[PDB]
Write a protein that binds this ligand. Structure first.
Ligand code: HEM
Ligand SMILES: [Zn+2]
Length: 118
């Protein structure tokens, strides 16, 4: 049903049921927008300055999520991407850069939504 909803989720370490380090840097619940058969997720990233790339799987490939807003003062931003089956794991990729702590990596993670959770 068309509209905007809260949706809880967890970020999981690649190919596991373990909570990813990344989970610390996203806000749950996300906002799910349902619009004529399609589902979009708007998700807030914390420590935005550090997260230099964020991609999700779509059409067999990986695509940069759209940045729909940034809050420079809070150092957060909101990315938006499409989801299909809210009960299935969604593959994602993230690139992290922290110059001062010489931390420069990219990773694969899965996102797992839980439509039933409040
Ligand atoms: C000062 C900040 C950070 C520190 C000290 C740190 C430290 C670590 C360490 C030691 C690991 C490998 C050991 C482990 O799995 O716990 C790791 C893995 C990982 N980190 Fe970082 N990290 C930091 C920031 C971030 C940020 C901002 C992200 C955003 C995505 C991130 C995402 C990940 C991911 C996806 C992994 C692979 C394992 C997993 O999914 O849990 N980290 N981090
Ligand atoms: Zn690495």
């Amino acid at each position: 049903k068309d509209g905007q909803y809260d949706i809880a989720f967890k970020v999981l370490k690649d190919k596991t049921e373990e909570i990813s380090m990344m989970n610390q840097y996203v806000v749950s619940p996300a906002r799910l927008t349902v619009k004529d058969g399609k589902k979009y997720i708007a998700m807030t990233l914390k420590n935005s300055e550090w997260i230099t790339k964020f991609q999700t799987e779509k059409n067999g490939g990986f695509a940069d999520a759209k940045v729909v807003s940034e809050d420079k003062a809070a150092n957060t931003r909101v990315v938006e991407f499409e989801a299909n089956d809210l009960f299935a794991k969604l593959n994602a990729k993230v690139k992290v850069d922290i110059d001062s702590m010489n931390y420069h990596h990219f990773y694969d993670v899965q996102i797992q939504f839980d439509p039933t959770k409040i």
